């Protein structure tokens with residue numbers, strides 16, 4: 001099966017599987033049951049921003065989610081991505097809906113990864129920045145219901161012609177090129193990701209959430225991962 005490290009923006013509390021009783025953000029290491037969570041005052045209809053950072057010196061995965069003129073939500077977890085992820089990976093965005101829904105719109109997404117070898121200076125880097133998605137975005141691997149181009153945005157889950165979010169939907173978008181996240185003899189490696197999202201729903205309890213994830217290169221949507229599984233895990237283990 002796939003190896004998944006993700007930062008989830010969980011809008012629906014599935015208490016039957018360990019979620020806290022409120023929308024939250026969490027750090028998921030190979031499991032949908034976050035190793036660490038933080039309360040998130042999600043705002044229906046507003047545009048938010050997520051920022052995720054990591055470096056091999058501190059070995060700490062941190063994320064901050066904010067809305068303009070509102071306090072931010074922060075979550076951190078000490079983890080050595082070398083002990084978890086394969087050397088080469090792919091990075092992406094995933095979302096789902098199930099019984100209750102929401103739009104899982106991404107307006108912008110940027111990512112930067114650096115890897116420095118022992119050889120004096122000479123750092124390797126990868127950076128991509130999408131501020132406008134188009135139809136036929138060949139540098140993205142769209143999976144499930146994910147689509148691009150509508151209003152220049154990336155809709156991870158199904159949205160009807162009039163803009164109504166559909167339930168029982170799942171979609172992901174991964175950057176085409178694999179990323180060298182670590183090397184056995186690297187002095188320092190780091191990455192930073194940023195994305196702005198718009199989650200709105202006519203439900204009083206939107207669902208299910210969006211996630212930024214890092215996986216094996218060949219990852220694909222596991223069967224029946226709609227809803228609470230955020231399109232990342234095959235089960236709730």
Ligand SMILES: OC[C@H]1O[C@H](O[C@H]2[C@@H](O)[C@H](O)[C@@H](CO)O[C@@H]2O)[C@@H](O)[C@@H](O)[C@@H]1O
Nearest residue numbers: 012014097098099100207208226227228
């Ligand atoms: O989209 C939210 C949520 O909807 C569905 O789960 C609800 C219900 O159908 C289940 O019977 C109960 C208990 O298991 O949980 C919910 O109330 C599922 O699609 C779920 O995956 C999803 O998160």
Ligand SMILES: [Ca+2]
Nearest residue numbers: 010012013014
């Ligand atoms: Ca949930």
Ligand SMILES: [Mn+2]
Nearest residue numbers: 010019026034
């Ligand atoms: Mn959760």
